Amino acid sequence: QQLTIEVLVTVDGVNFRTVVLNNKNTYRSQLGCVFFNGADISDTIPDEKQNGHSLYLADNLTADETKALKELYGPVDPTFLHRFYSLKAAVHGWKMVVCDKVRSLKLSDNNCYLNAVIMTLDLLKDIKFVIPALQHAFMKHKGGDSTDFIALIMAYGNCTFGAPDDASRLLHTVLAKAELCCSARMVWREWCNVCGIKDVVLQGLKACCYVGVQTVEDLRARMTYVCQCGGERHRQLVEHTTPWLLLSGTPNEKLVTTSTAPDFVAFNVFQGIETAVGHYVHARLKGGLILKFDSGTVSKTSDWKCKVTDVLFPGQKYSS
């Protein structure tokens, strides 16, 4: 050969393994796709200066490294680790501003949908992710370093850097890997004129999120579908205790105004055409005005006609 180095290889930052390498072939041919200090050095020749440092591996995992991969991230797709490492490097160029102690993502590479997702997740109290990598990146996000959490949710949501995406889709994909740390219930009364009446109960995080409606009045409205027997089946909410309610629907025009003092506390907005590239804006209701957090910029208005997607309501206390 010429020179021999021994690098340590990890997929979780905790467990490592030593790999003896040459200066006669690249990292990819000897070891595989490796990242060093947030940079893909797979196609470079190992230098003696990079002797005893740590590398983050993305493919060619050993049997125990796939076990460590699943224990940290869960059952992920074969391209997950390479996409997450690539996203984590490109997200480093972004900037997370904190205006009056609320975080917002500056606009870059059409990341406005990530701004609505992050700023909505910041309001969800008593949530915790059941995937360790997500929870680890979530704590670092709530501590001042969001690049890990931004890149992770883009990897789980299969988002492409620089391409616009769906904020409502990613928000619920992210929440699918989370649980609530407090009591929450919702009871749907189902009944068919043949089979009879039957109650179903959802507890925890699933009792705080609904996709389809955007107002509380539409949530408790009676719904009709087909029963298992083939007949008409009805459904209606008859009990609802929750710390907060997230209602998501397709972009719908509404005149959000501070005249009637609306009951919801925050909502997302999709500006532009749906078939074309649009711009997402996160909004909160502080004091007596609407605070439009438009990707680093802040605005205030008493009224606003906008296409609302997600709406966030306070705690629910309801029964009938």
Binding site: D165, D166, T173, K206, C209, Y210, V211, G212, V226, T275
Partner: protein, 71 residues
Amino acid sequence: MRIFVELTITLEVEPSDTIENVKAKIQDKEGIPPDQQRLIFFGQQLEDGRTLSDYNIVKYSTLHLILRLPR
């Protein structure tokens, strides 16, 4: 087992099929790419990894279909 997907189409499915398997049989019918498919059941967005049994998808269940933005 027969289910319905929202216009309304009907699919012959098994309770062990994954959501990605359901999105696959929707692309063969309507032609929508599975990445652009958002399936909603009881207000819950369905994940590709889980099966119809996890969401308790039973006979004659209705799945709502939303396109990924931008469409």
